[PDB]
Amino acid sequence: DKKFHGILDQGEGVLIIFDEPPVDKTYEAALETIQNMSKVVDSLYNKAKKL
Amino acid sequence: EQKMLLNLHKKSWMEGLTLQDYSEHCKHNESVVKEMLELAKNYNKAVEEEDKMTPEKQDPKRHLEEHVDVLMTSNIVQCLAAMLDTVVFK
Amino acid sequence: DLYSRYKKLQQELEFLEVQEEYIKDEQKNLKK
Amino acid sequence: YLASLIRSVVALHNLINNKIANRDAEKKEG
Amino acid sequence: ATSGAVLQAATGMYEQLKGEWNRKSPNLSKCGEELGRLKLVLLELNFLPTTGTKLTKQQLILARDILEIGAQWSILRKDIPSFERYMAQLKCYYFDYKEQLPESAYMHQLLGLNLLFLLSQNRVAEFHTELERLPAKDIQTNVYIKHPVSLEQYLMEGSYNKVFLAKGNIPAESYTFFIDILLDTIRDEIAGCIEKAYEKILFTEATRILFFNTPKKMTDYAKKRGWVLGPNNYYSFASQQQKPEDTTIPSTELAKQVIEYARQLEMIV
Amino acid sequence: RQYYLSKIEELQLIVNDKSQNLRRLQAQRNE
Amino acid sequence: PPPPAPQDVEMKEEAATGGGSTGEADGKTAAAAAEHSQRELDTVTLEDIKEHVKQLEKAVSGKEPRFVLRALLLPFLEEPMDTEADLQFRPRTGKAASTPLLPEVEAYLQLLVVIFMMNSKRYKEAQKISDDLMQKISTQNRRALDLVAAKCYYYHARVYEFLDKLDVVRSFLHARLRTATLRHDADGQATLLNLLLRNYLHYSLYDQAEKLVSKSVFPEQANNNEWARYLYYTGRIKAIQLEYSEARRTMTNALRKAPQHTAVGFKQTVHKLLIVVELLLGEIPDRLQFRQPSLKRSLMPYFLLTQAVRTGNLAKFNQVLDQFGEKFQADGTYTLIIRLRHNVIKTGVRMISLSYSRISLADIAQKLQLDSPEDAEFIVAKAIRDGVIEASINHEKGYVQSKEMIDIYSTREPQLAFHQRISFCLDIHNMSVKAMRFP
Amino acid sequence: VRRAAVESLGFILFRTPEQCPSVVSLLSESYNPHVRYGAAMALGICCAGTGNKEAINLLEPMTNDPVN
Amino acid sequence: ITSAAGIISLLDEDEPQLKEFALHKLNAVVNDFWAEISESVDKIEVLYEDEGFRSRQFAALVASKVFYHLGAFEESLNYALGAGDLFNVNDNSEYVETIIAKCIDHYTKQCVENADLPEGEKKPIDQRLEGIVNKMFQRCLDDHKYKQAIGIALETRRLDVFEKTILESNDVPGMLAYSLKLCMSLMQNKQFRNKVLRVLVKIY
Amino acid sequence: DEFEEFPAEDEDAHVWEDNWDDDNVEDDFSNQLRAELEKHGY
């Protein structure tokens, strides 16, 4: 349920606490930008049929 | 008198090898990429109105140009300064 | 006569080389 | 990467429009 | 023209070669001298067709057999370069004139020897390319081609265990010598890529995996390989893999790359 | 005759390509 | 009205095309970036499927008699290149002879018309050899020659498949290949190499594509249409050469170069060898490569073959392997018998290597029906030698272990990947800037 | 110095006047007005008294330039 | 087809007449199998170095065809340069056209470089290249239209043949004026301008 | 440029995207789970 940051391993019978890095919005902005550049690339593909 | 006065804005060598600030640089890239996304959003509309009603420099194209230019040069110079500092300073 | 044409072509190539070199310099100075 | 890719995209967009415009002029001239 | 008498004399000396190669302990020097005379007589004959008149096929066919003899002569000397140089010219006779000449009974055995020789020197890509030349019917039918391709398929499907002990099916002694080369070649390549594969291997278990019916040869092998036999008698290979180049920041290469980026950005063209 | 015409042909190719390049460079400088 | 259809449009649009090409040939003599390809698509769409036979209503039989003299069907053909017509229009001099050449074969009636093609081609040969020695002046007749010569002598190679083999096609074109090379590439170099490879491959002969390897390099200006052909051919060279990786790479590069849906035959041919070269690496091909409509009932057998290969049951593969052999030969890839029947295990040990970080040498053998672990050790070792699997082997305790799953992002790898894309994007920008302006 | 340097082109290219329009056609319209005056003078000198036509084609807008 | 090039072994074998017969065989197949026969590299290239070999010029011709086919034109010129007689004297095909198109180009480059510093500072020039160049001159001096060699001679700084060209029939004194036109209007090198003017007044 | 030199040459045309795993054949997962559950004795 993500209410608590940690990870189990039964093979060692242990739970582990980590540092949860702050997602780094740069990469999400990057993905949205490249996806929208893919959209504009399809737009240019709609063009260039007029040659 | 030339380059006697210029010493006033003359960049120092430590200023040249200064590595800026990594947290601030990450904030700068964070803001500029988001602005890039918001510019590309309407750049898509601009390219989707390619139909040439009433043939008409505001918004998407050159703004995207200046953004990519400044972002790319800042990132390149920061990486180069970091690398030079890494290899030369020990 | 073909020799005159060949020399004219070579001088045209040289003049175009001068043209592009000047254009490079002007691009740099105009950017600044 | 993102900056360079966007630069390539805008370069292609200028290229295609330039080709379209000069070809339009050539077709109109005839 | 005297070319008829030239052909008759050439056939006579070729028959002398056939008789001398019929000997079970032939003196290869006399046959080589007769090959030297064939060198001279073949000048009046030709390798490329080159002829403005459609030659009677006999002129070709005898030459065919002659090179075929030179093939079986070569494998009798166990001189691989001679086999290579004779096969390189006999290929033209086999293939360029295929529509005109019939099948020689020696061509399957010789072709199989050539393919499994290509295996002997690890000429694997060329070996596969030649399999396109020879149609599917013969690789399906004749043992002389099927068996070497069978061993190669065994190698791809990894049946080295079968390769090292299925030697009873091989047709001729020339095959035996070529595969007495391939067993050590296979051992050498297995040893070379074990560096990729294993981090440790027991000597006595290695002797099984390479199917050494002579354990001594591995020590000679190991001394050849330079393998550091462990204190508990183990070959080890992780010493070359290590933890490579990660800690050492390559640096200057990154600087050159960033310089290249800055160039390709600020340069005018 | 071989030299003259083979030359003028290759230098014609070069000068044509160079003229196109000069055209694009002039356009960029003009902007 | 249907028979007069060429008179209404075709007779005048072809005249306009010829006039425009000659004007480009006369003024703005750089007639190489013009409508040539854009117009010559009309050929395949309309013209070769129209000029094929001596149609009446002035459609074909009336072409030459009306076009008899141009001083400002062979006997009718003799006059347009004769009758003291002005000969400086080199595109006209080429086209007047080459106009029936492709359509005449496109009729394919094969009856006494093969002789027509066989002689009209040597008419073009005489014209071209006469043009070559005089060192034709600067009017791009090399471009107009190379492509139509390629197509017409391809058709004559078909005829030399009907009769004595097509060696002559190679020997001449190779001689022209250097002739094209020493002056400049008029896009003729690409198609000449393509035909040289095609002549080798029709004989399944291959290796003397020592030409294809860097003894002589392929030109970069191949219009994306010679690119697809040459890349397919070199993929086929590298496939049987046991280097399947770069063959699959370059031919996956090739496949996207084909048109949307008009190259159905070429697309079928490329997919037909792409799927097998992929399974040769143990990688199952993509499903979308079996869902294209016209490609289903053509790629269906190898689909079933793929259904056979994603198992350790090579017996199931063999049970249907002989079921469709003749359609493998008709499609010219049946040599799959030599290159699939034994490497089928490679995919199985691949999937195991994906599923298991650690496994026993016995277990890998059990679930792909292998006999003994003594065999399985050699199989996994071979998979390591080929490099298809990144595992490690330790017989001392029966271990097959995947290497450490290190985080790649804290290493040099992301920088290397991003550097490849940086170079690609900057190259795209550079070649884009290189080609804006021409007015 | 820019003005005089451009003006100096006429004294060195007059042997083949037809090149002078081809080179000066870009110095002819530049942000710097001194370069513009130099371009005009160099074009005039280089063509001498020969009616190059194209030189006049370049000078036709230039005689309407805002700068005096 | 003859799709194999192993016949190169006939040149590996020490019989020089067999080597020459093999060379004659390659010369019929050079431009169908150039890549394969070039892959033999030293096995054919050392035959020029074999001074004991009878017809070294034949191997030289074959290797020059090899390099012309391979695009290493300078190596083609160099491998031809030791042939002699079998060198170039016969105009046969486009290959000969290309090798002359490169060889006298190399000669004129060398002559331009030497003529700038010839006051005993000149650099040695192979007399076989000079021989083929003057053979080309002899051909063009009477072939069909000999009013072309004047331009080459002044380009290659060969004043003697330049003086000869207009001393011949030359069909009109308009050619003696055309030489002056080219000297004064297109050749702008003063250091040779003066020499050409001296030759022109000597003609006049 | 078009490739005429090659053999251009509702059986099952469902629109939805599918994978190799959908053509696989096995008994109902209800049956699989039932058999697994009985045989280990629960």
mmCIF file of N, CA, C and O in Angstrom, chain C residues 1-8, chain F residues 4 8, chain I residues 147-148 150 175 178 182 186:
data_model
loop_
_atom_site.group_PDB
_atom_site.id
_atom_site.type_symbol
_atom_site.label_atom_id
_atom_site.label_comp_id
_atom_site.label_asym_id
_atom_site.label_seq_id
_atom_site.Cartn_x
_atom_site.Cartn_y
_atom_site.Cartn_z
ATOM 1 N N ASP C 1 40.873 25.540 -76.876
ATOM 2 C CA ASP C 1 39.713 26.240 -76.339
ATOM 3 C C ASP C 1 39.213 25.567 -75.069
ATOM 4 O O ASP C 1 38.815 26.237 -74.117
ATOM 5 N N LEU C 2 39.231 24.232 -75.064
ATOM 6 C CA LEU C 2 38.835 23.490 -73.873
ATOM 7 C C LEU C 2 39.753 23.805 -72.698
ATOM 8 O O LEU C 2 39.320 23.764 -71.540
ATOM 9 N N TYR C 3 41.018 24.126 -72.978
ATOM 10 C CA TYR C 3 41.944 24.523 -71.923
ATOM 11 C C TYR C 3 41.494 25.808 -71.241
ATOM 12 O O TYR C 3 41.608 25.946 -70.017
ATOM 13 N N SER C 4 41.003 26.771 -72.024
ATOM 14 C CA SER C 4 40.493 28.009 -71.443
ATOM 15 C C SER C 4 39.320 27.722 -70.518
ATOM 16 O O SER C 4 39.212 28.301 -69.431
ATOM 17 N N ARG C 5 38.430 26.820 -70.935
ATOM 18 C CA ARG C 5 37.308 26.433 -70.088
ATOM 19 C C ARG C 5 37.788 25.759 -68.808
ATOM 20 O O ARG C 5 37.237 26.002 -67.729
ATOM 21 N N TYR C 6 38.812 24.908 -68.906
ATOM 22 C CA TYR C 6 39.330 24.236 -67.718
ATOM 23 C C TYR C 6 39.926 25.238 -66.736
ATOM 24 O O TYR C 6 39.694 25.153 -65.523
ATOM 25 N N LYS C 7 40.703 26.195 -67.246
ATOM 26 C CA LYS C 7 41.270 27.220 -66.375
ATOM 27 C C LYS C 7 40.185 28.097 -65.765
ATOM 28 O O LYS C 7 40.288 28.488 -64.595
ATOM 29 N N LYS C 8 39.143 28.413 -66.537
ATOM 30 C CA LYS C 8 38.026 29.182 -66.001
ATOM 31 C C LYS C 8 37.332 28.422 -64.879
ATOM 32 O O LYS C 8 36.975 29.003 -63.848
ATOM 33 N N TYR F 4 41.476 17.120 -70.635
ATOM 34 C CA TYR F 4 40.700 18.353 -70.584
ATOM 35 C C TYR F 4 39.267 18.079 -70.160
ATOM 36 O O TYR F 4 38.758 18.694 -69.216
ATOM 37 N N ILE F 8 37.429 19.028 -66.638
ATOM 38 C CA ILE F 8 36.317 19.975 -66.589
ATOM 39 C C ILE F 8 35.057 19.313 -66.051
ATOM 40 O O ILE F 8 34.282 19.952 -65.339
ATOM 41 N N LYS I 147 45.930 21.456 -81.338
ATOM 42 C CA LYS I 147 45.894 22.755 -80.677
ATOM 43 C C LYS I 147 45.316 22.627 -79.273
ATOM 44 O O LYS I 147 44.401 23.366 -78.896
ATOM 45 N N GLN I 148 45.842 21.680 -78.505
ATOM 46 C CA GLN I 148 45.448 21.492 -77.117
ATOM 47 C C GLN I 148 46.693 21.455 -76.245
ATOM 48 O O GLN I 148 46.659 21.851 -75.077
ATOM 49 N N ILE I 150 49.343 23.124 -76.115
ATOM 50 C CA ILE I 150 49.940 24.380 -75.674
ATOM 51 C C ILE I 150 49.541 24.616 -74.226
ATOM 52 O O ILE I 150 50.380 24.973 -73.392
ATOM 53 N N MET I 175 46.654 31.181 -83.391
ATOM 54 C CA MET I 175 47.116 30.357 -82.279
ATOM 55 C C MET I 175 48.291 31.009 -81.559
ATOM 56 O O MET I 175 48.384 30.953 -80.323
ATOM 57 N N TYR I 178 46.589 33.301 -79.420
ATOM 58 C CA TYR I 178 45.845 32.634 -78.357
ATOM 59 C C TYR I 178 46.766 32.257 -77.207
ATOM 60 O O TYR I 178 46.369 32.304 -76.035
ATOM 61 N N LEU I 182 46.194 33.418 -73.336
ATOM 62 C CA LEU I 182 46.214 32.556 -72.156
ATOM 63 C C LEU I 182 47.313 32.944 -71.178
ATOM 64 O O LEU I 182 47.095 32.907 -69.962
ATOM 65 N N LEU I 186 45.014 34.286 -67.975
ATOM 66 C CA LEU I 186 44.598 33.215 -67.077
ATOM 67 C C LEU I 186 45.749 32.669 -66.241
ATOM 68 O O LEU I 186 45.524 32.175 -65.131
#
